[PDB]
Each structure stands twice: as structure tokens, then as C-alpha cells.
Ligand binder design. Sequence first.
Ligand code: G59
Ligand code: G59
Ligand code: G59
Lengths: 244, 244, 242
Amino acid sequence: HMIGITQAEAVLTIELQRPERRNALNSQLVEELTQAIRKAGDGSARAIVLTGQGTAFCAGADLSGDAFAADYPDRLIELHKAMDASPMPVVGAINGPAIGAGLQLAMQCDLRVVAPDAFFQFPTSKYGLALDNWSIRRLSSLVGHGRARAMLLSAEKLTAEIALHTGMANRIGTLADAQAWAAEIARLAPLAIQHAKRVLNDDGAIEEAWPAHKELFDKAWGSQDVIEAQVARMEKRPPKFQGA
Amino acid sequence: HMIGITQAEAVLTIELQRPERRNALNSQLVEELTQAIRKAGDGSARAIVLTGQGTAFCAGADLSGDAFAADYPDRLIELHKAMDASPMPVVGAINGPAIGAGLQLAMQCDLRVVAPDAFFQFPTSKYGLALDNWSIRRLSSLVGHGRARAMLLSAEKLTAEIALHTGMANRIGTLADAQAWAAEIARLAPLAIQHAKRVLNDDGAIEEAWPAHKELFDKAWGSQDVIEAQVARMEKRPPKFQGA
Amino acid sequence: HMIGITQAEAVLTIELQRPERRNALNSQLVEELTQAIRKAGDGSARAIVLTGQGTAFCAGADLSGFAADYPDRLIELHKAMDASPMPVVGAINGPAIGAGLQLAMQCDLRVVAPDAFFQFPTSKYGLALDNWSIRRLSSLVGHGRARAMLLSAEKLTAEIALHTGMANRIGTLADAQAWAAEIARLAPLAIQHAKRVLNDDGAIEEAWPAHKELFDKAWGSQDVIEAQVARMEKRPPKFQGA
Ligand SMILES: CCc1ccc([C@H]2C[C@@H](C)n3ncc(C(=O)NCc4ccc(F)cc4)c3N2)cc1
Ligand SMILES: CCc1ccc([C@H]2C[C@@H](C)n3ncc(C(=O)NCc4ccc(F)cc4)c3N2)cc1
Ligand SMILES: CCc1ccc([C@H]2C[C@@H](C)n3ncc(C(=O)NCc4ccc(F)cc4)c3N2)cc1
């Protein structure tokens, strides 16, 4: 009900379809993606393109109305595990802004073909949030530690142009470009690709949060500032953070 | 006496004031810098800007005249510890050259706004010495392993265009530029900044030296070549090292 | 007889000499190189320069020649370079591909001719790399470009190599030799320390159980046969993932 799926010449394109929320995730969208990823190649697909409808790739998370908000985090980890464990290369066609969970998702693709007007961002410093370790480590490998520091510590946006600079975007292109490239890849040695994907993903980015990490991470999520961020956004005004 | 402290709109600015020696470090300067970091936000400050007076950010160390010079190496570790552990994000305004101890200092800053004429350098292989591991890891993360190899194996300077290029510098600009950036960050959510800083610093660069590293470290520090480099300098001639 | 060695004031230059097979590494070429490096500085030299003769740095690997324990030899060669007290400046004069890219990355610094390029064409031939090749490559071009070079045999040009740090400088053999001569006037102990610490950034990594498995599946696959046959006949492979 919330995604689209088309196959053509060995490439399965999966498409987020919540353009009204700019493809913001919730319980259902994530669950249906998990499912769509696992069942790809069933199907004689050899490659996956992951993209979005309308202007954005994925603007973040929007659990409002989500009858099942509660269990949206585990749903999300499931999505990631599935992508990680997939023998298919996932070419993300980042057709537009990738923000928050949108950037996490983008980063979990195996390759990135990026639209001229797209940008990438972790605005967590704006909402008082805290990221898991994989996000922080994988971001740093993609834009370099220094840019990573500024995206994380000051909510700085990575432009398509600079994504191409750092390697976060592998190419700048359209959906069709991404799909054309995926076709080339679908014609390569799958086992070669499967080994490489796996070694690459095991570079250490998948990291258990240290105790100091889990502590500060708990402290931020449970904080009243997380509430203020949302209220202030509700009331179209700047948040007054207490650091508490 | 050896540093300056001023505050504006939740931004504490700390300025190295030993311009007659190009801000080179010693006991007093290191000691006072430590006190300032720690007592920052005591205070309503939610961000620190760190910079140097005169033409240079920090040109290294000058134990000349230093009475407590024996235990300076520990004092220096404490400064880094204090910075690493501050909940305050630290914006380095690199107003000019950062060499040796100063490059280290610059790297311990959380973000870097670099002046067009500033440059970075570990002239280590010229003076016959060896770095701690952190210095090498954090460098690699910021300029990339390729460029770190050159800076370290051939004492090559990193100009500001290239620092902007790699992420070593987040922006190119003035003390003022950095301060206005520090003002924006000071309005972000403190607890999200603190979590991300901790995890970013725990990327593995704070690494204990392997056995063979400490053997090469001691051998270099205890070499005849360390003296040759100094006398050759004092005689304005090419040094002629021995590997000993 | 398969490499050239010359010395000019503290700089020892080793040249690969199979331009007729674009400097591809075989058992004897691998052997003599290992030796040359071990016996370097014996010898007043303080820096080494490594380059290939003709148009290529190293086109890859070549088991033409009684060479089954070739994989061990090729590992000793890297063990030798990693262990060498002297810094090795790679004058990458032409394309470095496969084992050739591996050899280039084991150099300590790289001066790259503007016409060279780099490539693991490993996904075209259904093969798998050792972990170090993948870690060092990521360190040198960034994780993002490494995924591309690894998952679709993307070539890295001298220009982007310069951009990412794979290439320190774009220049000639002469340029590399001049740079080595400077490096040979710096403090050896300081250089030895840095080299060791840098090489121990974690890239020398043992394959996990899962990696070793996929590695074996790939190497022992039929798709390897199909890749060689398809290549030989200038035609697209029809892989099966088996
Ligand atoms: C194994 C492949 C893989 C699995 C999971 C992930 C990421 C995806 C991301 C949405 N995400 N969000 C939270 C988590 C996650 O791991 N949460 C548990 C946790 C506990 C204490 C902490 F301090 C931090 C995190 C996670 N894991 C990344 C990669
Ligand atoms: C925990 C945050 C942190 C603290 C300290 C450091 C750095 C700062 C730098 C000035 N610095 N200088 C010497 C040391 C240092 O760690 N010296 C001990 C040592 C022992 C054997 C060796 F082979 C090498 C080093 C150090 N550690 C980096 C990060
Ligand atoms: C210690 C310095 C060093 C030594 C060796 C290597 C590289 C060089 C490359 C030619 N090369 N080729 C095969 C191997 C290699 O490591 N083969 C053993 C192996 C076992 C199971 C696996 F899944 C993967 C690999 C290797 N290691 C890199 C660095």
C-alpha cells in the first residue's frame, strides 16, 4: 500500500511512495520495505534500485498516526539487517533530500547515484536526538571524519556536489542513470559481489555502542529537549534547549 | 597572563597570547589553557572558540626558559584529556600556521575554521622524532591516509585549500566567521552535541601504542640523530643522519 | 634478469622488466623483487623507488612459468615491503591492475603518471580479494569510491587518484626520484616509526569466518570458468552465481 515495485532486465526498482510526507518513514513503510528487500530475486533480479516518489528520497521519520509507532525502531533495525544481509547490490537513486532516517537508509545502500538538487543531512542536533554507532561510523567513511564532525555537531547539509567530492555520491544522475548502472552490475559475477559487499560492510562500522555511548544516548532521547524540539516545530518558532 | 578569555552570547573565546614565540607551548601556557577549558561554561557558555594572537595559531613547543619543563609532557596530555572530555564543542579558528604540538592542538578542536594563509605540518621526520598514535590516527582521518603518509614520511605541509579539500578545515575564514558559527551551534541541543562528540572521538584514534611502535618511538627519541638535527639547524646546514 | 636495479646517491631504483607482458607478476619476477627489497640498503641507500618499464606499472598476475605456491611468494613480497625500514616511492608510470594495484598500494607513497589508472576488475572475473586489499583501498580512495571500484570494476584515473590521495603527486619517474632523494636526507628512525604505525592502522586484517567462506565460494565457482571463456572470446559473460 505504501511502496511500488517494478522489475526490468535483472533490475528490481523499489520505490518509496509517501510523497505527501516526502517519503518519511513509519511502522508500515519500513515493514513493507523489509519485505520487498528480502523477497527480491524470486524473481530473477540480480540488482536492486532503491528510490523515492516526488521531490525527496526520504525526508525522515513521521510516526504521527502510526498506530504502531511503539515498535518502529525494531522494524527499522530489521530493514537495515535485511539490506546488510542481502546478496543483491542496492543502488540508491537518491532523487532528492535524504534527511535523518532518510540518510541512514541512503547510507545502507551499496552504491549511490544522486540527483543534482539532492542534499544529505543529520539534523539531530536540532531535535536533541542521538544516533546509533553504525550511522556515525558509516557517515565518517563516506564524507570523511572532518565533514562528519560538522554534519553531526552542527547539522550541516551535504550538497550533491560535495557528496560527489567525498564519495558519498558515487555519481550524479537520475533514476534512469541509476537503473542503467544497476543493469551493468546485474551482469557481473554475483559471488564476487557478495564477498566484497560483506567484507566492505564489516569494515568495523557495525559497532556496539560503548557504555559511555549508551549513557549519553539514553540521556538525550529521554530528555525534555526532545519534546521542546517538536513543540517549537509545531509552533513555528525557535526551540529553547535546556540541555536536560 | 599567557592566554586571553572573553565571552559573547554563549560563546567563550580563548586566545593563545604568546605571539613573540608564535604561540609555542610550555608549562604555563598549557596549564592555563587547561583551566580555561574546564571552567568554560561556569559560566553560561555553550560553545568555545579557540584561537591565536599574531601571525600563527601555534608553532609547536618552546621549553626555553621553562622552569617546570620536566613534566610538561604530562601537563600536555592533561590539556588534551580536558578538551576530549569537555561537553563544550570547540571551534578552532586557525588564524595561521599550526605545527607540531600546534597541529595536535588544532586536531583536538571539534571543528576547524581555517585562515587562507594557515598551514599544517608535522616536521617530525626532519627533527628525528616520533608521534603518539592518536596524532597519527586523527591526522589520517582528517586528510586521508594517502596525504597523511606524505605529511608524516616527508614532513610535507598541508595548505588550507587542501585542508578544506579533505575536511581538515570545515570552512575557510576568519576568527569572526568562526565566532558566528560558534553562536549558531550554541543554540543547538547540548545533549545531542555531547553524545556525538564522545562517539566521534571514540572512533579508535585514541589508541595505545603497539609494542613495535613503542620500540621505534623510544629508539627515535633516544637517537643521536635528534641532536644532529638541532646542531645542523643551529649551524644552518643540511643535517646528516645515521639511523641512530 | 627480470628487473633492473640502479642507485644514485642514497636512492635505489628497482624497475620491473616484462613490458612484453605489461609487467605482470609471475613467480620469478615476484622472487627477485622480494630479494631486491630485502637486500636494499646494503647498500648505502636510504630510499627505494619502484617503477615499471614501458607503458604499464603492473597489468596484474601471470602464472605462465611450476608455480602453485605462488600465493605464498606474493605474500612474502608484501611482507618484505611492509617490513622494509626504507620508504618506497611508487612511480606508477602506467596502469596498475589487480595484483598490480595491490603492489602499488604497498608502496609508501605514489607518484602517478597522468595516463595511469587503477582497477580491481575482480567482479568481472568472479573472484574475491584478501581483506588488506579492501581495507587499504578504502583508506586510499574513501569507502564510497571503494564500494564502486570493488562492486563494479570501476577504474580510478590519475586525476581522481590525486583527488582522493591514492596519488600523492602526478609526475614522472624523475619526479619520484627527486622526491626520494629528499626523503633519503630525512631521519631514518622517524620514518621507520611512522611507516610501521601507519601500516598498522588495522588494514592488515585477518579474514573473518564469513569472509573466508564467500571467498572460497567465489574462487571455487563455475562463474570463474565462464568469465575466462567469455573474455577469451571477446563476449559478455552469462554468469549464474554458482
Ligand atoms: C547488521 C547491519 C546493520 C544493522 C543495524 C544498523 C543500525 C540501523 C539504525 C536504524 N539503527 N538505529 C538504532 C540502532 C541500534 O543498534 N540501536 C541499539 C542501540 C542501543 C544503545 C545505543 F547507545 C545505541 C543503539 C540501529 N542499527 C546498521 C547496520
Ligand atoms: C583521551 C583524549 C586524548 C588524550 C591524549 C592524546 C595524545 C596527545 C598528545 C600530545 N600526546 N603526546 C604524547 C602522548 C602519549 O600518549 N604518550 C605516551 C606514549 C607512550 C608510548 C608511545 F610509543 C607513544 C606515546 C599523547 N597523547 C590524545 C587524545
Ligand atoms: C603483513 C603485510 C601484508 C601481507 C599480505 C597482504 C596481502 C597481499 C595479497 C597479495 N594477498 N593475496 C592473498 C592474500 C591472503 O591473505 N591469503 C590468505 C587468505 C585466506 C582466507 C581469505 F578469505 C582471504 C585470504 C594476501 N594478503 C597484505 C599485507
